[PDB]
Amino acid sequence: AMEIHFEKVTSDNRKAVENLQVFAEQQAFIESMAENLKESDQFPEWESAGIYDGNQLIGYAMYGRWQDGRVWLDRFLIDQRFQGQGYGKAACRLLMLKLIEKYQTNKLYLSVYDTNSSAIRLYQQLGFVFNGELDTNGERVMEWTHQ
Amino acid sequence: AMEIHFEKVTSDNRKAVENLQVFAEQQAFIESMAENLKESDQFPEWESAGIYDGNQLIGYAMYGRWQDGRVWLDRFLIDQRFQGQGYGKAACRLLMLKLIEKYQTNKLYLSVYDTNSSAIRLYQQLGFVFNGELDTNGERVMEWTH
Ligand SMILES: [Cl-]
Ligand SMILES: [Cl-]
Ligand SMILES: [Cl-]
Ligand SMILES: [Cl-]
Ligand SMILES: [Cl-]
Ligand SMILES: [Cl-]
Ligand SMILES: [Cl-]
Ligand SMILES: [Cl-]
Ligand SMILES: [Cl-]
Ligand SMILES: [Cl-]
Ligand SMILES: [Cl-]
Ligand SMILES: [K+]
Ligand code: NA
Ligand code: NA
Ligand code: NA
């Protein structure tokens, strides 16, 4: 019957884990977000934010200065009820400007999966370019430079 | 009118953020999971594992013993393809036994959202009980004492 075992995440299975299908587990993603928030609250390097249009919460973002001094956009979500209507790009641009005002640097960093075309296009339109680096999770790094 | 602004997450809006309707966004999940793995790999307290049935990846776990001294079950997911087949109970039970061996403790902790009926049931069936504590995110803590 069942042969349940656990494996450390490595390059051999990381992408399989990243592609775990979970597109109905509404209660599960509640738990995912609660942990997301807990993990951000744990370390002062990280900060979570709700994204609002007026009084309506439309999304979420996590970001922060990592130890190397690089500033990262770690998570960025728009609620499904509000997608396809220019919120992501508008919110992402504003977040970018807030980050480079908060911190000294004029560079921001993120990493993307090699198939997330909907997101890559958004970040590309906002000035993010692939910089030839790989993140620790094997994702391709993108970098926004201000000038 | 479009009026975009950003608010710190506090008790005023945390549960609103926790309930963001992002459960139908496939590509968003890949990034969410990738970020989970990045954060897990960063801190030695935390460990991520794939859950397998033989050669089939069926789920994901994240767990850690933090500076406080308690061992937590931080993240636990079963792929929606293999839901409702008993993999939740069996894998969680096996994971519990792994952690009390790996660490010195005979206790394990998790926290759950109140409206999560399946989770509270599942965890209770395995021996977890509400211990009257609140987590940092406002979730009710459950505890399993071996
Ligand atoms: Cl195992
Ligand atoms: Cl695999
Ligand atoms: Cl849009
Ligand atoms: Cl590019
Ligand atoms: Cl490149
Ligand atoms: Cl703002
Ligand atoms: Cl608060
Ligand atoms: Cl998608
Ligand atoms: Cl979870
Ligand atoms: Cl299950
Ligand atoms: Cl109980
Ligand atoms: K999770
Ligand atoms: Na990333
Ligand atoms: Na780790
Ligand atoms: Na929790």
CSV table of C-alpha atoms and ligand atoms in Angstrom, one decimal:
chain,number,residue,atom,x,y,z
A,1,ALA,CA,0.0,0.0,0.0
A,2,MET,CA,1.3,3.5,0.9
A,3,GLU,CA,5.1,4.0,1.2
A,4,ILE,CA,5.2,7.4,3.0
A,5,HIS,CA,8.7,8.9,3.4
A,6,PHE,CA,10.2,12.4,3.4
A,7,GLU,CA,13.1,13.9,1.5
A,8,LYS,CA,15.2,16.9,2.1
A,9,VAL,CA,14.6,19.5,-0.6
A,10,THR,CA,17.5,19.6,-3.1
A,11,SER,CA,18.0,20.6,-6.8
A,12,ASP,CA,16.7,17.1,-7.5
A,13,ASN,CA,13.1,17.8,-6.2
A,14,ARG,CA,12.9,21.6,-5.5
A,15,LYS,CA,11.1,22.4,-8.7
A,16,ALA,CA,8.7,19.5,-8.2
A,17,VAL,CA,7.9,20.9,-4.7
A,18,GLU,CA,7.5,24.4,-6.2
A,19,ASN,CA,5.0,22.9,-8.7
A,20,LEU,CA,2.9,21.1,-6.0
A,21,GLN,CA,-0.7,21.5,-7.1
A,22,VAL,CA,-2.9,23.2,-4.4
A,23,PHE,CA,-5.4,25.3,-6.4
A,24,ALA,CA,-8.5,24.7,-4.3
A,25,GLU,CA,-7.2,24.4,-0.8
A,26,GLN,CA,-8.7,27.7,0.4
A,27,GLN,CA,-8.2,26.8,4.0
A,28,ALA,CA,-4.7,25.7,3.3
A,29,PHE,CA,-3.7,29.0,1.8
A,30,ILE,CA,-5.1,30.8,4.8
A,31,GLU,CA,-2.6,28.7,6.8
A,32,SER,CA,0.1,29.5,4.2
A,33,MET,CA,-0.4,33.2,4.6
A,34,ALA,CA,-0.6,33.0,8.4
A,35,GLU,CA,2.8,31.3,8.4
A,36,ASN,CA,4.1,33.9,5.8
A,37,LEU,CA,3.1,36.6,8.2
A,38,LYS,CA,4.5,34.8,11.2
A,39,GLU,CA,7.9,34.4,9.5
A,40,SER,CA,8.0,38.0,8.5
A,41,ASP,CA,7.1,39.1,12.0
A,42,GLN,CA,9.9,36.9,13.4
A,43,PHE,CA,12.8,38.7,11.7
A,44,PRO,CA,13.2,42.6,11.5
A,45,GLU,CA,14.9,42.2,8.1
A,46,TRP,CA,11.5,41.2,6.7
A,47,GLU,CA,8.3,43.3,6.5
A,48,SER,CA,4.9,42.3,5.3
A,49,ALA,CA,2.3,44.9,4.0
A,50,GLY,CA,-1.3,44.8,2.9
A,51,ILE,CA,-2.0,46.4,-0.5
A,52,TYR,CA,-5.1,48.6,-0.5
A,53,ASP,CA,-7.2,50.5,-3.0
A,54,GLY,CA,-8.8,52.9,-0.7
A,55,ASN,CA,-10.4,50.8,2.1
A,56,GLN,CA,-10.4,47.6,0.0
A,57,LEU,CA,-7.5,45.2,0.6
A,58,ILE,CA,-6.5,44.0,-2.9
A,59,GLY,CA,-3.2,42.2,-2.2
A,60,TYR,CA,-0.1,41.6,-0.2
A,61,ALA,CA,3.7,42.0,-0.4
A,62,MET,CA,6.7,41.0,1.6
A,63,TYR,CA,10.1,42.6,1.2
A,64,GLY,CA,13.2,43.6,3.1
A,65,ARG,CA,17.0,44.2,3.2
A,66,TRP,CA,18.8,40.9,3.2
A,67,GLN,CA,22.2,40.6,5.0
A,68,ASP,CA,24.2,41.3,1.9
A,69,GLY,CA,22.5,44.8,1.9
A,70,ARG,CA,20.5,43.9,-1.2
A,71,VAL,CA,16.8,44.8,-1.0
A,72,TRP,CA,14.4,42.1,-2.2
A,73,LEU,CA,10.8,41.8,-3.1
A,74,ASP,CA,10.1,38.4,-1.5
A,75,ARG,CA,6.4,38.0,-2.1
A,76,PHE,CA,3.9,39.9,-4.2
A,77,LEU,CA,0.2,38.9,-4.6
A,78,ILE,CA,-2.9,40.5,-5.9
A,79,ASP,CA,-6.3,39.1,-4.9
A,80,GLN,CA,-8.0,37.2,-7.7
A,81,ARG,CA,-11.1,39.4,-7.4
A,82,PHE,CA,-9.0,42.4,-8.6
A,83,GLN,CA,-6.6,40.9,-11.2
A,84,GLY,CA,-6.4,42.0,-14.9
A,85,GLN,CA,-7.3,45.6,-14.0
A,86,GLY,CA,-3.9,47.3,-13.6
A,87,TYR,CA,-3.5,46.9,-9.8
A,88,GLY,CA,-0.4,44.7,-9.9
A,89,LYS,CA,1.7,47.1,-12.0
A,90,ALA,CA,0.4,50.2,-10.2
A,91,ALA,CA,1.1,48.6,-6.7
A,92,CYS,CA,4.4,47.2,-7.8
A,93,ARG,CA,5.7,50.5,-9.1
A,94,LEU,CA,4.7,52.3,-5.9
A,95,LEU,CA,6.3,49.6,-3.8
A,96,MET,CA,9.5,49.9,-5.8
A,97,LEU,CA,9.7,53.7,-5.2
A,98,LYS,CA,9.0,53.3,-1.5
A,99,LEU,CA,11.8,50.8,-1.1
A,100,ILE,CA,14.5,52.9,-2.8
A,101,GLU,CA,13.3,55.9,-0.6
A,102,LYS,CA,13.5,53.8,2.6
A,103,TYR,CA,16.9,52.3,1.9
A,104,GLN,CA,20.1,53.9,0.6
A,105,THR,CA,20.5,51.7,-2.5
A,106,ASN,CA,19.0,52.4,-5.9
A,107,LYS,CA,18.8,48.7,-6.8
A,108,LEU,CA,15.9,46.2,-6.1
A,109,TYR,CA,16.0,42.4,-6.5
A,110,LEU,CA,13.5,39.6,-7.1
A,111,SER,CA,13.7,36.1,-8.5
A,112,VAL,CA,11.1,34.3,-10.7
A,113,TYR,CA,10.3,30.8,-12.0
A,114,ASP,CA,11.3,30.2,-15.6
A,115,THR,CA,7.7,29.8,-16.7
A,116,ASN,CA,5.9,32.6,-14.9
A,117,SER,CA,5.4,34.7,-18.0
A,118,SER,CA,2.5,36.7,-16.5
A,119,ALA,CA,4.9,38.0,-13.8
A,120,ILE,CA,8.1,38.4,-15.9
A,121,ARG,CA,6.3,40.6,-18.3
A,122,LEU,CA,5.0,42.8,-15.5
A,123,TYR,CA,8.5,43.2,-13.9
A,124,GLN,CA,10.1,43.7,-17.4
A,125,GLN,CA,7.6,46.6,-18.1
A,126,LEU,CA,8.7,48.1,-14.8
A,127,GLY,CA,12.4,48.0,-15.6
A,128,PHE,CA,13.5,44.7,-14.0
A,129,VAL,CA,16.1,42.8,-16.1
A,130,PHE,CA,17.6,39.4,-15.8
A,131,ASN,CA,21.1,39.9,-14.3
A,132,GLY,CA,22.5,36.4,-15.0
A,133,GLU,CA,22.3,35.3,-11.3
A,134,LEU,CA,20.5,32.3,-9.7
A,135,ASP,CA,18.8,32.5,-6.4
A,136,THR,CA,19.3,29.8,-3.7
A,137,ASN,CA,16.0,28.3,-4.7
A,138,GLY,CA,17.3,28.0,-8.3
A,139,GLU,CA,15.1,30.8,-9.5
A,140,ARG,CA,16.5,33.4,-12.0
A,141,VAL,CA,17.3,36.7,-10.4
A,142,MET,CA,16.0,40.0,-11.8
A,143,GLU,CA,17.4,43.5,-10.9
A,144,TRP,CA,15.9,47.0,-11.2
A,145,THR,CA,18.4,49.8,-11.5
A,146,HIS,CA,17.3,53.4,-11.1
A,147,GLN,CA,19.9,55.9,-12.2
B,1,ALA,CA,-10.5,56.5,-8.8
B,2,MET,CA,-7.4,54.4,-8.0
B,3,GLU,CA,-6.0,55.0,-4.5
B,4,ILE,CA,-3.2,52.6,-3.9
B,5,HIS,CA,-1.5,52.5,-0.5
B,6,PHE,CA,0.4,50.1,1.8
B,7,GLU,CA,-0.4,49.3,5.4
B,8,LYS,CA,1.7,47.4,8.0
B,9,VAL,CA,0.1,44.1,9.0
B,10,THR,CA,-1.3,44.3,12.5
B,11,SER,CA,-4.2,42.6,14.3
B,12,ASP,CA,-6.5,45.2,12.6
B,13,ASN,CA,-6.0,43.7,9.2
B,14,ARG,CA,-4.0,40.5,9.6
B,15,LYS,CA,-7.0,38.2,9.2
B,16,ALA,CA,-8.0,40.1,6.1
B,17,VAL,CA,-4.6,39.5,4.6
B,18,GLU,CA,-4.7,35.8,5.7
B,19,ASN,CA,-8.0,35.5,3.7
B,20,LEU,CA,-6.7,37.1,0.5
B,21,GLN,CA,-8.4,35.2,-2.4
B,22,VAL,CA,-5.3,33.9,-4.1
B,23,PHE,CA,-6.3,30.2,-3.9
B,24,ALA,CA,-7.0,29.9,-7.7
B,25,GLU,CA,-3.7,31.4,-8.9
B,26,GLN,CA,-1.4,28.6,-10.1
B,27,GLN,CA,1.7,30.6,-11.1
B,28,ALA,CA,1.4,32.7,-7.9
B,29,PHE,CA,1.6,29.5,-5.9
B,30,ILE,CA,4.9,28.4,-7.6
B,31,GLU,CA,6.4,31.7,-6.5
B,32,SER,CA,4.9,31.4,-3.0
B,33,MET,CA,6.4,27.9,-2.6
B,34,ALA,CA,9.8,29.0,-4.1
B,35,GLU,CA,9.9,31.7,-1.5
B,36,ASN,CA,9.0,29.2,1.2
B,37,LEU,CA,12.0,27.1,0.2
B,38,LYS,CA,14.3,30.2,0.1
B,39,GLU,CA,13.3,31.3,3.6
B,40,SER,CA,13.5,27.7,4.9
B,41,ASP,CA,17.0,27.2,3.4
B,42,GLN,CA,18.2,30.5,4.9
B,43,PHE,CA,17.6,29.7,8.6
B,44,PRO,CA,19.1,26.5,10.1
B,45,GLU,CA,16.2,26.3,12.6
B,46,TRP,CA,13.8,25.5,9.8
B,47,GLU,CA,13.8,22.5,7.5
B,48,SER,CA,11.7,21.8,4.4
B,49,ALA,CA,10.9,18.3,3.1
B,50,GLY,CA,8.9,16.8,0.2
B,51,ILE,CA,6.3,14.2,1.3
B,52,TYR,CA,6.4,11.0,-0.9
B,53,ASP,CA,4.4,7.9,-1.5
B,54,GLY,CA,7.1,5.8,-2.9
B,55,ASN,CA,8.4,7.7,-5.9
B,56,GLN,CA,5.5,10.1,-6.1
B,57,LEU,CA,5.8,13.6,-4.5
B,58,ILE,CA,2.4,14.0,-2.7
B,59,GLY,CA,3.1,17.0,-0.4
B,60,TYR,CA,5.3,19.4,1.5
B,61,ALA,CA,6.3,20.0,5.1
B,62,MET,CA,8.2,22.7,6.9
B,63,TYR,CA,9.2,22.4,10.6
B,64,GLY,CA,11.7,23.9,13.1
B,65,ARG,CA,12.9,24.2,16.6
B,66,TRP,CA,13.3,27.9,17.2
B,67,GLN,CA,15.4,29.8,19.8
B,68,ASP,CA,12.5,29.5,22.3
B,69,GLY,CA,13.0,25.7,22.4
B,70,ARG,CA,9.7,24.5,21.0
B,71,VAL,CA,9.4,22.3,17.9
B,72,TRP,CA,6.9,23.5,15.4
B,73,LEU,CA,5.0,22.1,12.4
B,74,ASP,CA,5.2,25.3,10.3
B,75,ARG,CA,3.8,24.3,6.9
B,76,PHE,CA,1.9,21.1,5.8
B,77,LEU,CA,0.3,20.6,2.4
B,78,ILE,CA,-1.0,17.7,0.5
B,79,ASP,CA,-1.2,18.0,-3.3
B,80,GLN,CA,-4.9,18.4,-4.3
B,81,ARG,CA,-4.6,15.4,-6.7
B,82,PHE,CA,-4.1,13.0,-3.7
B,83,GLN,CA,-6.5,14.6,-1.2
B,84,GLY,CA,-9.1,12.5,0.6
B,85,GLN,CA,-7.1,9.3,0.5
B,86,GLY,CA,-5.7,9.3,4.1
B,87,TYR,CA,-2.3,10.8,3.2
B,88,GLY,CA,-2.8,13.7,5.5
B,89,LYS,CA,-3.2,11.6,8.7
B,90,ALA,CA,-0.5,9.0,7.8
B,91,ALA,CA,2.1,11.5,6.7
B,92,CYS,CA,1.5,13.9,9.6
B,93,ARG,CA,1.7,11.0,12.1
B,94,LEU,CA,4.9,9.8,10.6
B,95,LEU,CA,6.3,13.4,10.6
B,96,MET,CA,5.4,13.8,14.3
B,97,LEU,CA,7.3,10.6,15.2
B,98,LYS,CA,10.3,11.9,13.1
B,99,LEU,CA,10.5,15.2,15.0
B,100,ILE,CA,10.3,13.8,18.6
B,101,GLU,CA,13.2,11.5,17.6
B,102,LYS,CA,15.2,14.3,15.9
B,103,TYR,CA,14.8,16.6,18.9
B,104,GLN,CA,14.9,15.9,22.7
B,105,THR,CA,11.4,17.1,23.2
B,106,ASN,CA,8.2,15.1,23.7
B,107,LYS,CA,6.1,18.0,22.6
B,108,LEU,CA,5.1,19.4,19.2
B,109,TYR,CA,3.3,22.7,18.4
B,110,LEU,CA,1.3,24.1,15.6
B,111,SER,CA,-1.2,26.9,15.2
B,112,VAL,CA,-4.5,26.9,13.2
B,113,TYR,CA,-7.1,29.4,11.9
B,114,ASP,CA,-10.4,29.0,13.7
B,115,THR,CA,-12.6,28.3,10.6
B,116,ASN,CA,-10.1,25.6,9.6
B,117,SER,CA,-12.4,22.7,10.6
B,118,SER,CA,-10.6,19.8,8.7
B,119,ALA,CA,-7.3,20.8,10.2
B,120,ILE,CA,-8.5,21.1,13.9
B,121,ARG,CA,-10.2,17.7,13.4
B,122,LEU,CA,-7.2,16.1,11.7
B,123,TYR,CA,-4.7,17.4,14.3
B,124,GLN,CA,-7.1,16.5,17.2
B,125,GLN,CA,-7.4,13.0,15.8
B,126,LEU,CA,-3.6,12.7,15.9
B,127,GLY,CA,-3.5,13.9,19.5
B,128,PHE,CA,-3.0,17.7,19.3
B,129,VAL,CA,-5.0,19.9,21.7
B,130,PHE,CA,-5.6,23.6,22.0
B,131,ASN,CA,-3.3,24.8,24.8
B,132,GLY,CA,-5.0,28.2,25.3
B,133,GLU,CA,-2.1,30.1,23.7
B,134,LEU,CA,-2.1,32.5,20.8
B,135,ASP,CA,0.6,32.5,18.1
B,136,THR,CA,2.2,35.8,16.9
B,137,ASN,CA,-0.3,35.8,14.0
B,138,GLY,CA,-3.3,35.5,16.2
B,139,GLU,CA,-3.8,31.8,15.5
B,140,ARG,CA,-4.8,29.4,18.3
B,141,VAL,CA,-1.9,27.1,19.3
B,142,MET,CA,-2.4,23.4,19.4
B,143,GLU,CA,0.0,21.1,21.3
B,144,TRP,CA,0.8,17.4,21.2
B,145,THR,CA,2.4,16.0,24.3
B,146,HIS,CA,3.9,12.5,23.8
C,1,CL,CL,11.3,9.3,6.1
C,2,CL,CL,10.2,14.5,-7.0
C,3,CL,CL,-3.7,43.7,-14.4
C,4,CL,CL,14.8,40.8,-19.2
C,5,CL,CL,20.8,36.0,-18.0
C,6,CL,CL,1.4,54.0,0.9
C,7,CL,CL,-0.7,43.9,16.1
C,8,CL,CL,-1.6,31.0,-13.1
C,9,CL,CL,0.7,25.1,5.4
C,10,CL,CL,-5.3,14.6,2.9
C,11,CL,CL,-8.4,20.4,22.0
C,12,K,K,2.4,26.6,3.3
C,13,NA,NA,11.7,34.6,-6.0
C,14,NA,NA,17.0,25.6,7.1
C,15,NA,NA,-0.2,28.3,12.0
